[model samples]
Target: KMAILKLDEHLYISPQLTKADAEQIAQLGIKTIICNRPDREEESQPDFAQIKQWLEQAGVTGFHHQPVTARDIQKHDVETFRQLIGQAEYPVLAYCRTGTRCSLLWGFRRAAEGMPVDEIIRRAQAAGVNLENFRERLDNAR
Candidate 1:
């Protein structure tokens, strides 16, 4: 699962970010990166510090839960993310293992923002993705 999707103005994420990759992303005009993957399942993951350093050097901001997990994405968390995205200067990117949940969160947030369910579905479908799972999460995503 790739971590980067060039959508919006400019934003990127790396699930298991490397120092070099972070720099490259920032150079590509990504102003922000959010690592949605937690570090707790460290059976096979890279160092957050190293990745953070690249962000710092690249003048890009980084955010993490130290061990961001699916369980961490609560209702309030979605609100926080919405706020972050709304306040962002460019498109915001968040990533996990497969980007499935990231896509899910995006769909849910759009629904909460007053986007009709059909509009959201149609938009995603146009992007070659299916967001039917979000139908249930929409009403309560906020």
Candidate 2:
């Protein structure tokens, strides 16, 4: 089962999920799904292209943002990610390898909205993401 972290009324962050998890998403009222993990990173990862079709059949919009690895995350990526979150129907679910990237992107979105670093850290920590290593980048994002 995929764990869910509620970031707000319309957004959630979670770890990578399998095609089998689609029903749970439907049950949870997720209207859109965003995947930040590329198949190259995990040989056993689900085929996102196929999953996209599956999600559509399940009545959900799906987006595969390619992959944003730790060293590859950029301002534009975050901007685009935030745009997707803003445009998506309520109760959107986004995931990466361990949900850290998803949380990281959300963290930046909150920061860009003028949320304090301390508060960001608090929220991230609650979701099992430690932003201590991102202090410099987080500050730079402001």
Candidate 3:
């Protein structure tokens, strides 16, 4: 089962998802899938190409791979993420190794958009993602 975590009405994050999770995503009415983790980060993780194929086969029309390294996340990365979410159909699902990178990306984007640090952390926490370590970045973003 995919550990899907909702960050808001339009975005969701998950730990590394498999081909099997595509069906579930479709059932949930998710119109897009974004991959935040890079290819071959782990031996067992499926490549984004395979994931894209699976999502397409399941009727998901939007598949994007914007690889992110947890410690190397940059301002442009956040900007791109914001852009992707902005243009996506709706209810986009982004995934990474443990969903932390995806969540942090989303949180940072929110912070850059003027969301309070506390509110960002609160929302992330509510989604089962702990963004306590991100407070400094979130604060600096705004």
Off by over 4 Å in 2: 62-66
Ranking by TM-score: 3, 2, 1
Runs off by more than 4 Å, candidate 3: none
Each prediction's TM-score versus the true structure? 0.67, 0.86, 0.93
The lDDT values for all models are 0.57, 0.76, 0.87
**Candidate 2 — which pairs collide?**
none
lDDT of 2 at 82: 82
Task: State model 1's lDDT.
Answer: 0.57
Deviation from truth (RMSD, Å), model 2: 1.9
Candidate whose TM-score is highest: 3
Write out the backbone clash pairs for model 3: none
In candidate 3, what are the lDDT values of residues 1-142, reduced to their tens digit? 5478788889988889897787788788888898999999889989999988778877678989999897899999988988999999998999998788988888887887889999999988877788898788789888
Candidate 1 error regions (>4 Å) = 1-3, 7-15, 62-68, 89-91, 118-134, 139-142
Q: Give the 10-residue window scoring lowest on summed lDDT in candidate 3.
A: 1-10
Give the better candidate number (1 or 2) by TM-score: 2
